Amino acid sequence: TWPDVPIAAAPGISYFTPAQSPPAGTARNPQTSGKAIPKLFQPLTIRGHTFQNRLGVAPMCQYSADDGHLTPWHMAHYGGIAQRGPGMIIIEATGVVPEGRITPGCVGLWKDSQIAPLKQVVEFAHSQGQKIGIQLAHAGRKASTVPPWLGGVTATNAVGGWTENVKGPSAIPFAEGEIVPKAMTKEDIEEVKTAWVAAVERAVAAGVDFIEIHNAHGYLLSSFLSPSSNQRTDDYGGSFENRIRLSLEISQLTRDTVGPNMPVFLRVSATDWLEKSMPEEKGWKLEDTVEFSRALAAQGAIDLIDISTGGVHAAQKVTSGVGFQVPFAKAVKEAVGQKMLVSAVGTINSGNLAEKILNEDDVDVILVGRAFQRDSGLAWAFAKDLDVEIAMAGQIRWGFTSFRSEYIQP
Amino acid sequence: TWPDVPIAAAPGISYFTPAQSPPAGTARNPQTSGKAIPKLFQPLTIRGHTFQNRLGVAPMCQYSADDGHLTPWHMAHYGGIAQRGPGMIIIEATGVVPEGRITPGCVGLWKDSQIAPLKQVVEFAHSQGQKIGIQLAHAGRKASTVPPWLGGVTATNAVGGWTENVKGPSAIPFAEGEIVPKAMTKEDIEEVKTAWVAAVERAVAAGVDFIEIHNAHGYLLSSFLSPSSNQRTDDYGGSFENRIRLSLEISQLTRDTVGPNMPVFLRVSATDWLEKSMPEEKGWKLEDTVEFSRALAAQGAIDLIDISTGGVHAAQKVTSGVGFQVPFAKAVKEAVGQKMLVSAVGTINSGNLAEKILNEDDVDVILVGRAFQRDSGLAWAFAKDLDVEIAMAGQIRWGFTSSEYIQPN
Ligand SMILES: Cc1cc2nc3c(=O)[nH]c(=O)nc-3n(C[C@H](O)[C@H](O)[C@H](O)COP(=O)(O)O)c2cc1C
Ligand SMILES: Cc1cc2nc3c(=O)[nH]c(=O)nc-3n(C[C@H](O)[C@H](O)[C@H](O)COP(=O)(O)O)c2cc1C
Ligand SMILES: [Cl-]
Ligand SMILES: [Cl-]
């Protein structure tokens, strides 16, 4: 006596959940308003993948991993964001070796047991049509510390640390009183590259849509760049060519393992923020980052440079503020044009400023961090900031619309 | 060389996650600002349990369960809320029998396999210091329908329905053209009572902190109250006492089963909204809800009456607006003073308005629905609107300051 109305399910998974067609965060085309779609909510395609808008979740450590293994905290964290249509999600820094975690709570992928917890989270994200990738990491001489809400102080062995297995380019503590890392041997560098392939391979089995390389914030790769942390006298220190070499190798290796269709990102710290505080230190400035991005666009393996700053030197003096890292992303996009995409991140907390950055600075992707801890639906917020009628999950949307559309007029 | 700093873990569980001392959403007492803590952020104790503030997540159907089983959808939903410190979480309407779900995607607790999926979510919430309970339900003559984003129309058997196993007090479809429900036999009600007791035990086995009885919104118990849906001629129909009889039995059975320490809530539809649209209809109005709340206060089984409205009759005309069901809770609170707790729900979108309802309408709990689907961190939102310094998870809190507490303004 009634028509048959089925509930379409997400494909390829062992549990039922409703499918969202199109995925949450997709601008209706045509907009019901008749207005043009702002640059922020126009899809972007990198190699084999399409992101339905250009707002990404910046990688954010949760310090809640159990021997590198994801827990239901990460299902609640990443999954609540995934239900609300960001354009992409960058999973937090994930250790490629145990001594490459930052803290005892860091995610890791040095082990096959670590794949399936990550795979459960990726799988639910894709049940939502969301794109999810992972930032592989090696904390270097900044490894073995406690989470930041506990001050970020050294994690001793009694409390889970590894103060005797901390490795960097050179025997230089990050600050006085911090762990003196062991200057990595050539075999250590070869061991890190070897572990890097295994971690990339482990991520690929888990189903990630892209890989980001953590080359920023004074961790292992970032510290090879800076002559403040790198005083090696071999093929990996001294000259500018040598200090970007390991970063260049990891980029080729990472490309070579994922093939020609998978997006590969690299995040770098554009400056060490010593311009005023330590002007006589030959460190790492925007000029160095621009020459670095020139080698990476020339090399052709990395698709997107994620520009961050600082963490490279303890004496940094960070000039914070709204969008305080956009100037560096603007200059790097200027250096590489369309050969490389560039993303911006850092105190970008309105949709209007996000759109302003994409158009006036020619940035490709807008990443937001903290605000996604506060607003798991920040993509919902930025669309409202921009008045974009967007798609949202049928479970969420039906109480924000009339009794009788797949899109939300925010 | 270096001081020893361990990361305390949540106790009694097989996975590491940082412990939250105090649970998120706890107003610092005393506030560092010296200001007083509003009632919305004053803890609440019901029998064996203490809630760290009075903001609750109202029950909200997700229509995404797998043969009644919770999925990672529910861990992302409830668990993302749980990280952000509400005073309580009321899990959605949970069917006690298969045919008592609303839709094929509704949760259930008629079967033992459904406990462990529930237990993973309750166990993650409790890792955060969260209080979490469940709304048990039976969709009645409004059962076997599709989710609301697909129109809420009948679900035929071809798409997962059970159009021949839909039961209510009387064989009266909810609207014209809808499924004609089967009029329950004496055995039908006893099977519900048997099924209800078992579902309580399954909920208690899953570890919930409280149970709410869904007696609202035109589902099974709501349809027994209203003479529009209930024309029975036995102990469950006719007189007003007969129409509230089943609700009274169900509440005591739950009380006897959960023991003396567990809070038991009951949600009711305070009015059917037929005053203007069907004025000559003997239906269910606030005067009945007050006599029912008085009878439940006399009984002593239920600790909190969850006041809602509507869903009881198809021609309802709901005059909505900000705090639009607050008047009914205000009259019910007056009739039951301190013998029973009372909550209010409905288009309550700021901490300022919430506090206002608490203080001069004297309700005990403020429930919010939609606003939690948008902001899983609404407890943070209402704390800022009221300038209340609250505790927040160390994973969330450390990027908004240079303490365990966050000054939200
Ligand atoms: C809690 C938290 C965790 C973070 N984890 C990482 C990380 O694992 N890797 C990384 O490159 N940056 C990390 N960051 C830095 C952010 O990804 C981002 O670049 C920075 O927060 C941008 O500023 P915003 O959060 O104010 O938008 C983290 C930041 C926060 C607040
Ligand atoms: C998506 C959604 C699902 C709901 N599911 C239930 C439910 O299962 N049981 C119930 O008693 N009320 C349910 N409600 C009603 C809410 O609990 C609440 O009483 C009502 O929505 C008013 O809350 P609000 O105005 O803050 O959204 C639901 C509401 C929404 C929007
Ligand atoms: Cl970082
Ligand atoms: Cl409902």
Residue numbers in the entry:
A (entry chain B): 2 to 405, 408 to 413
B (entry chain A): 2 to 403, 408 to 414
Article sentences:
Ene‐reductases (ERs) catalyze the asymmetric reduction of C=C double bonds in α,β‐unsaturated compounds, where the double bond is conjugated to an electron‐withdrawing group (EWG), such as a carbonyl moiety. In the next half‐reaction (oxidative half‐reaction), the reduced flavin transfers a hydride ion to the β‐carbon (the carbon next to the EWG).
The C‐terminal region is also involved in dimer formation and shapes the FMN binding pocket of the other monomer. The FMN cofactor, situated on the C‐terminal side of the barrel, has interactions through the phosphate group with the side chain of Arg371 and backbone nitrogen atoms of Arg371, Gly370 and Thr348 (of the adjacent protomer). The ribityl part is stabilized by Arg368, and the isoalloxazine on the re face via hydrophobic contacts with Pro60 and Met61, and the backbone carbonyl atom of Pro60 to N5 and N10. The “arginine finger”, a distinctive characteristic of Class III ERs, was observed in PsOYE2 being represented by Arg371. In place of Arg in comparison to YqjM, PsOYE2 exhibited a Trp, which participates in the substrate binding site and might contribute to form a large hydrophobic substrate site, along with Phe, another residue believed to play a role at the same site.
